[PDB]
Amino acid sequence: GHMGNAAAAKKGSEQESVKEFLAKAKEEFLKKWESPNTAQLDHFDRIKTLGTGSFGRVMLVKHKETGNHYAMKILDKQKVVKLKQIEHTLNEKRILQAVNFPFLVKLEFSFKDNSNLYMVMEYVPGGEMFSHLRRIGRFSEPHARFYAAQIVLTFEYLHSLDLIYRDLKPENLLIDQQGYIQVTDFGFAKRVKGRTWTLCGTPEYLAPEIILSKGYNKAVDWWALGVLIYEMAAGYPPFFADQPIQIYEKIVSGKVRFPSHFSSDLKDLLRNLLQVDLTKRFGNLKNGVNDIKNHKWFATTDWIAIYQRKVEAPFIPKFKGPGDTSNFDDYEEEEIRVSINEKCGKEFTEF
């Protein structure tokens, strides 16, 4: 076979240890999930905007009492107007409260006022994977593999808790001071026991079954991992067009082309992730995540060493001191206005 006796038994024992870990992780998650206003706005100095989207923004803030720095996500309650926009915000807070994994950003406080919802997380100063990737062009395959392995482990953890992530992309992956990944932005994450139906995510990363309005499951995250690995190694994603409608047409076609510099092992992995047929997609078969972890392209990956953060990272961002923002792009700064009247109070009772 491909493995000898010593290797096969080591692998089996490793796989049983993963099961033992995930059983304990699920017990710890459920305790926090069943048992979810830990600060207020004037406890923080607002320093700089780190990113902006349609419903709000993330700012670097400094805690006045401790001097610690954090990333604060601010959501305008009125702008969170659409039905799925509201439910998704409650998902995000509750999931972040309850999870614990070395590559998942840690929530510290959440609170709300008359105008806004707030989530205060750990500040990750090395910047988005997105801007390092665009600056250098593409990552070599060992570099891309080091990040991919962290996503595989993070999805194995989330999916074992029945959580789907649903917004993987380089814009949502921050690089910490040791060069490891921190997944942020759980705005699209959801606990799903079987199928779910919301049409959501980012066009280039959508699985075909989402675009086709089919009920779908956690296998959409494994498709998105194929898109991410392709983009990291190529410098552009596999389904690439100026307008979302054109992107959707390419995704549903079933027709990926690869740069001539991709290794054959990489192409084989990507064909099995970017698989339209759900009866054939890696991550979705009887052997689950192990079809990915045991693929030839990951043969050099020490999965436990990645989890334990024992592996030397390919790139360490430069950091000048606490509250350094040099690894982030600049954004227009807008005043944070809090109305004298409560907005949308009944809609956000649970937050």
């Binding site: 989207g53 926009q85 665009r134 917004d167 959501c200 552009y236 100026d242």
Partner: peptide, 14 residues
Amino acid sequence: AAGRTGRRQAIHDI
């Protein structure tokens, strides 16, 4: 060919 090179916004519905 041509495609989106800047940051990509997610879509909550549709």
